[PDB]
Short mmCIF file of C-alpha atoms in Angstrom, two decimals:
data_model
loop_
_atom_site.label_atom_id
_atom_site.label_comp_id
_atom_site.label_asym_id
_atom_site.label_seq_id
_atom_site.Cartn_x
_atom_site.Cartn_y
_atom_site.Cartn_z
CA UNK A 532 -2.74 15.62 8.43
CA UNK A 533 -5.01 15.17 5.30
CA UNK A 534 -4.02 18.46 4.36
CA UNK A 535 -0.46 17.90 4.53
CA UNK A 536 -0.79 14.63 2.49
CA UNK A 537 -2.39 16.05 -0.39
CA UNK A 538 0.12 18.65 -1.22
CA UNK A 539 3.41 16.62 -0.26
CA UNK A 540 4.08 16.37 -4.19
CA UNK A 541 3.45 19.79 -5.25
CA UNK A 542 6.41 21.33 -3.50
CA UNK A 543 10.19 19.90 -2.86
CA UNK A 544 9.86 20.24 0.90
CA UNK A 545 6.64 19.52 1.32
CA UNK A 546 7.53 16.43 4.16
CA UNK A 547 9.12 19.30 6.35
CA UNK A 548 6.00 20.40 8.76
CA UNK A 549 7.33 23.97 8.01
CA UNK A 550 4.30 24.73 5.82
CA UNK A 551 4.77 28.77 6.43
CA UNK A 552 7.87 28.15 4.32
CA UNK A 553 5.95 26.65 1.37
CA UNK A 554 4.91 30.06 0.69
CA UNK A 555 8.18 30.67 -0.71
CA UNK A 556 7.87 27.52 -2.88
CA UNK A 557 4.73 29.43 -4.38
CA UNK A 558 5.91 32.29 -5.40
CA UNK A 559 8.62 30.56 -7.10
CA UNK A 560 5.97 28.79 -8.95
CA UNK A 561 3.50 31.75 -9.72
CA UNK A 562 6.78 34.55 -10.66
CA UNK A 563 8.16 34.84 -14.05
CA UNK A 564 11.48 34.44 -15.16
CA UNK A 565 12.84 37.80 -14.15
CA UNK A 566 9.55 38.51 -11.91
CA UNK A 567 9.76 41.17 -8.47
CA UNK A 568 9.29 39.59 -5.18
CA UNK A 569 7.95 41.63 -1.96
CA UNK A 570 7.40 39.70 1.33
CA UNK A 571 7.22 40.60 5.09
CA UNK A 572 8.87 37.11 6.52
CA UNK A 573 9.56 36.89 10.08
CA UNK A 574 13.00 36.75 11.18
CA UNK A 575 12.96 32.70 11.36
CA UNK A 576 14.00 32.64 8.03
CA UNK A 577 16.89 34.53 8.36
CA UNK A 578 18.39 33.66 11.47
CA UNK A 579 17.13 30.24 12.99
CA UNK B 50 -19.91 6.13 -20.13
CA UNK B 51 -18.63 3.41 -18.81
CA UNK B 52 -15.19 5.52 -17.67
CA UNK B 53 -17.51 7.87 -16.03
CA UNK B 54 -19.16 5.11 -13.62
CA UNK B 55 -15.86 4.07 -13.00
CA UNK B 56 -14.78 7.63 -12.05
CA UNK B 57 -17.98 8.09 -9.57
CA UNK B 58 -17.60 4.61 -8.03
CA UNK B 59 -13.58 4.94 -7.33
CA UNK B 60 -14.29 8.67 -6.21
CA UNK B 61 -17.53 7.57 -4.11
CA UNK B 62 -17.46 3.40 -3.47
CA UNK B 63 -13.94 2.88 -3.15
CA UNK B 64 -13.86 5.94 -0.64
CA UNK B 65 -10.66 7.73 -3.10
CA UNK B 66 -9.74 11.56 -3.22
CA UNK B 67 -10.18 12.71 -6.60
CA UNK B 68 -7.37 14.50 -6.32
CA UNK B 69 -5.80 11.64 -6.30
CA UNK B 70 -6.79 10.57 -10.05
CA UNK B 71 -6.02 11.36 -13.62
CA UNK B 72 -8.23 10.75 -16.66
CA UNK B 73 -5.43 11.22 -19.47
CA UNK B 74 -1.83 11.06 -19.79
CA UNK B 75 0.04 11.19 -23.15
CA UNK B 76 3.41 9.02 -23.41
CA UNK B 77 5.60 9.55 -26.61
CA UNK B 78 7.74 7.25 -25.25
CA UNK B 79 5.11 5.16 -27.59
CA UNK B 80 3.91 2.90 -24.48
CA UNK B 81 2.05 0.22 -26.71
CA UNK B 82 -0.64 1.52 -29.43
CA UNK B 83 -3.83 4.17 -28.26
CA UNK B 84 -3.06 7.23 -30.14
CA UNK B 85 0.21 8.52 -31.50
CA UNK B 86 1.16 8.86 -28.52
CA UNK B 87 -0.41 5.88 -26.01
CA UNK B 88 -2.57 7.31 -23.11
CA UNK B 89 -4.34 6.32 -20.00
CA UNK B 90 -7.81 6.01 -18.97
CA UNK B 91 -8.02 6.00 -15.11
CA UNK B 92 -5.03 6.33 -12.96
CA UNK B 93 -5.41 7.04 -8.93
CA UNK B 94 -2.40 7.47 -6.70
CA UNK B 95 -1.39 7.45 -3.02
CA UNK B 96 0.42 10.83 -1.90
CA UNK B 97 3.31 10.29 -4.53
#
């Protein structure tokens, strides 16, 4: 709970209880323009 | 000194996340007359 409230502003879908997804957010945030992303995400993303 | 008691006894007294606070925030949208640019001194949110 506490946890969730203090980084609902950082990210644009924080509300969503999805949190594994926030990940993505991250690495939005930490990559360069024109930056290489490598990630082993479970098939949930893709198909649910 | 005086910001700095303020600071412990909203972090400590009044039970508030420092997280939740910010010391200085510049404006050049010339919000009254502090600097060049008006700032605050003590700002704490809620989760927005």
């Amino acid at each position: 709970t506490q946890t969730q409230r203090e980084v609902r502003n950082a990210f644009l879908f924080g509300d969503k209880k999805n949190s594994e997804n926030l990940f993505i957010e991250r690495y939005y945030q930490l990559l360069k323009e024109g930056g290489r992303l490598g990630v082993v995400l479970p098939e949930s993303v893709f198909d649910t | 000194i005086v910001r700095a008691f303020l600071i412990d006894r909203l972090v400590n007294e009044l039970d508030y996340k420092p997280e939740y606070l910010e010391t200085e925030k510049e404006y050049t949208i010339k919000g009254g007359h502090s600097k060049i640019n008006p700032r605050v001194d003590v700002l704490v949110k809620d989760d927005k």
